[PDB]
Amino acid sequence: DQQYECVAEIGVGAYGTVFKARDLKNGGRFVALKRVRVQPLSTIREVAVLRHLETFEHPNVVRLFDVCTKLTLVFEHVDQDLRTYLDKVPEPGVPTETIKDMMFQLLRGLDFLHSHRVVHRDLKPENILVTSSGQIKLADFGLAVVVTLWYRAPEVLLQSSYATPVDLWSVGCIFAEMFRRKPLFRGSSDVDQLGKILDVIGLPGEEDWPRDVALPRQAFHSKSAQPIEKFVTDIDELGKDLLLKCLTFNPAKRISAYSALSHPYFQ
Ligand SMILES: CC(C)n1c(C(C)(C)O)nc2c(F)cc(-c3nc(N[C@@H]4CCOC[C@H]4O)ncc3Cl)cc21
Structure with missing residues (x-):
């Protein structure tokens, strides 16, 4: 051309x-x-x-x-991704209302895709673009150190399901990362990523663990669900509720992008 x-x-x-x-x-x-x-x-x-x-x-x-x-x-073309944006933001970090605005824009883009039966499946700061005006634009979907691993939902790691909730898990990881400016769950393999997730959210109910998978619940020995404020320090009460609704083990119980748009955190 x-x-x-x-x-x-x-x-x-x-x-x-x-x-x-x-x-x-x-x-x-x-x-x-x-x-x-x-x-x-x-x-x-x-x-x-x-x-x-x-x-x-x-x-x-x-x-x-x-x-x-x-x-x-x-x-x-968009000049920067969310990774570059987070790397360059000066201390003490992204302003509270800017985290709120970017997350709302991210969920609006995802709700658009999910309403037209498109699942991103690889949502990460690398493919969430930030325009010169502060607008969030989703990129790199619809076709076909591994950063991807850090945003993978437990059902992908377990090889059980790949429906729209997979993206809401990635949203939760990214939401926490907006405050931390470092990945929430930084694992080095599928099994290790799942272990590190369960060390924070705790072991789910035995009936929530998927059937017909290689990794049983018994392979993980996480004693308790730790308070999310220990890992995300500046998060408020409403933001904490939305974050845990995104980081729900069972994909059927996980909040959708549509419902997340109506969460009191955005009111
Ligand atoms: C890089 C990655 C997410 N990416 C991949 C693959 C398959 C490699 O994952 N396909 C991609 C694609 F088709 C398009 C873009 C894209 N990129 C920019 N700008 C970039 C953003 C990053 O900083 C440098 C800027 O130039 N603007 C708009 C778009 Cl749509 C990125 C893609």
């Missing part, structure tokens, strides 16, 4: 590469140019879902400017 000039590599990329490029036909604005290889109905369907979502132009998801044919996806 001689309409885009690649200036820097944003990353890779299970089946392609993403570049920061100059959009030569639209005033030379920056775009995130993703080139995806093909070896396919599964892939065609996924890009149709992406194009359909773009018709709504939701304020909390990145704009998809163009799709070209081996597949070129052109998105609006």
Whole structure:
């Protein structure tokens, strides 16, 4: 494509590469140019879902400017991710109302995706973008040290389920991280990540542990659920309630993005 000039590599990329490029036909604005290889109905369907979502132009998801044919996806460029934002915020950290605003915007973007049956499945500060105006935009969904591990829901770690609640667990981890400015659960393997989660939330009821999984409840020896204020010190009463509703072991009992939008923490 001689309409885009690649200036820097944003990353890779299970089946392609993403570049920061100059959009030569639209005033030379920056775009995130993703080139995806093909070896396919599964892939065609996924890009149709992406194009359909773009018709709504939701304020909390990145704009998809163009799709070209081996597949070129052109998105609006955002200068920073939430990881970079949190790394640069000076002491004593992110202001209370800014944490509230960013979390509300994040849940609005996720509620949009979940209402159109799209599950992000890889929600982390690296793919939550922060615009120059302070707007939160979700990115890197709908296709296909491992930072991903730290935001994985117990049901993904156990290999039991992958429904919309998976993203609400990641929201909970990110919410706690907005205050801490360090990951809540920093594990080095699937089993270890689950162990570190249960050391904080405690062992769930025996009936809440999923059936037909390799890791039984008996493999974890967490004595008690610790108070979340020990790990998230500046969090208020309402924020604590919303956080624990996100960090609920059983995905059926976990708060949805829709209900989280109505939580008294945002009133
Ligand atoms: C990097 C990662 C989350 N990413 C991946 C893969 C598959 C590698 O995970 N695909 C990606 C993709 F298609 C697009 C973007 C994207 N990036 C920016 N800007 C970036 C943000 C990070 O700081 C440098 C800036 O240039 N703006 C808008 C968009 Cl939409 C990021 C992607």
